[PDB]
Amino acid sequence: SAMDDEYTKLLHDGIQPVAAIDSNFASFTYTPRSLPEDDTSMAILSMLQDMNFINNYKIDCPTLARFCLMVKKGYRDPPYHNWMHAFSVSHFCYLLYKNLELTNYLEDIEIFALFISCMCHDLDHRGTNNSFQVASKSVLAALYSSEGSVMERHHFAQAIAILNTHGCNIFDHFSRKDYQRMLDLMRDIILATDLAHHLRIFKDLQKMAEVGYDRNNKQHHRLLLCLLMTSCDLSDQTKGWKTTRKIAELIYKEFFSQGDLEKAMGNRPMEMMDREKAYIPELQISFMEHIAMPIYKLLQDLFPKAAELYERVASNREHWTKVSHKFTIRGLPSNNSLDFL
Numbered sequence: 001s002a003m004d005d006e007y008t009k010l011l012h013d014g015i016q017p018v019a020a021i022d023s024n025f026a027s028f029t030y031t032p033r034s035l036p037e038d039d040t041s042m043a044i045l046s047m048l049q050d051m052n053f054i055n056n057y058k059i060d061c062p063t064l065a066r067f068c069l070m071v072k073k074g075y076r077d078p079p080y081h082n083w084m085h086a087f088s089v090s091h092f093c094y095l096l097y098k099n100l101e102l103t104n105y106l107e108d109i110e111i112f113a114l115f116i117s118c119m120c121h122d123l124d125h126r127g128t129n130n131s132f133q134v135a136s137k138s139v140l141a142a143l144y145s146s147e148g149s150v151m152e153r154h155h156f157a158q159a160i161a162i163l164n165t166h167g168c169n170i171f172d173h174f175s176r177k178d179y180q181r182m183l184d185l186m187r188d189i190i191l192a193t194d195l196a197h198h199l200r201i202f203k204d205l206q207k208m209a210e211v212g213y214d215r216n217n218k219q220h221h222r223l224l225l226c227l228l229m230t231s232c233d234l235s236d237q238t239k240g241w242k243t244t245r246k247i248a249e250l251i252y253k254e255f256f257s258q259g260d261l262e263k264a265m266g267n268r269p270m271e272m273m274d275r276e277k278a279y280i281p282e283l284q285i286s287f288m289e290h291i292a293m294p295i296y297k298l299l300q301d302l303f304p305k306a307a308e309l310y311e312r313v314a315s316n317r318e319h320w321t322k323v324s325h326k327f328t329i330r331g332l333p334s335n336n337s338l339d340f341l
């Protein structure tokens with residue numbers, strides 16, 4: 001009933017101009033988590049319209065409205081891996097489109113697949129990682145653990161189940177070859193969100209940036225799509241310090257909750273998921289140094305206009321070192337009590 005009325009307005013009221021969402025909506029400085037959640041499905045439509053994908057691919061507006069709502073409704077509400085994460089990852093894809101001239105690098109359909117993949121790439125996340133699915137002998141591991149990337153295979157399978165839901169296949173008028181192409185792209189792009197995949201291809205990403213992007217090289221296209229998706233996935237770290245701090249809070253709430261579950265199973269959590277061992281400033285510096293900063297350095301090497309993104313991640317990294325001293329309790333706790341000992 002609720003989705004029906006939301007559908008009715010999304011379809012019949014018209015698509016809001018993207019500039020009416022916010023004066024800075026298309027800037028790397030904009031924080032899409034600032035958008036009220038109730039406004040995000042209309043913002044998805046506005047972005048799709050502004051990138052001309054609705055007209056170029058003749059997407060049926062009722063199908064697209066239903067698709068967007070079905071995708072939003074396909075996310076659960078863990079602290080981090082929720083619909084607002086998918087919305088902000090999708091928004092960053094729109095930023096790359098508006099700021100970095102992707103049409104000089106990628107086919108139209110590849111850019112479209114990236115954006116749709118961003119919307120779908122964490123569908124039905126339960127707030128636990130791939131190792132946990134295997135350790136807990138979850139249904140998802142029973143399905144996919146022999147292939148790896150258990151959660152990401154599930155996210156892709158969930159996106160297909162939405163497309164296979166009557167009235168929701170935004171691609172169903174595509175040619176057979178274009179349809180196969182779109183779903184293949186979605187597979188590769190969603191599967192690239194496994195950071196284990198990113199780490200596997202990282203040297204090939206380095207090699208691509210070194211020799212220089214070849215628009216006629218099909219492997220360069222695939223590699224670039226993977227890097228862009230990862231850049232979208234981690235894009236929370238490219239905003240201000242306030243965003244980085246809040247996003248850290250959400251990640252560790254989620255992580256520590258999984259760690260609490262691992263302990264109740266008799267298993268030793270990773271220290272970054274153990275609330276009794278994790279030292280957040282050191283983990284955030286490590287994550288920025290070894291994972292986040294190299295990704296945006298690569299993005300800058302390929303796209304010089306992405307320099308500000310790398311400098312932001314580097315800045316946020318310096319902020320963690322500056323505030324680290326505040327995790328040590330000097331003097332007495334604010335209650336004047338040593339009871340916590």
Ligand SMILES: Cc1cc([C@@H]2CN(C(=O)c3ccc(F)cc3)CC(F)(F)C2)n2ncnc2n1
Nearest residue numbers: 195233234235236237247248251272283286287
């Ligand atoms: C935007 C953003 C996203 C993530 C994570 C990274 N991540 C990992 O596997 C991972 C690997 C090494 C680490 F040191 C920490 C986490 C997968 C995920 F949890 F899905 C999202 N983090 N993590 C810390 N700050 C983050 N900021």
Ligand SMILES: [Mg+2]
Nearest residue numbers: 121122193194
């Ligand atoms: Mg994911």
Ligand SMILES: [Zn+2]
Nearest residue numbers: 121122193233
């Ligand atoms: Zn994600």
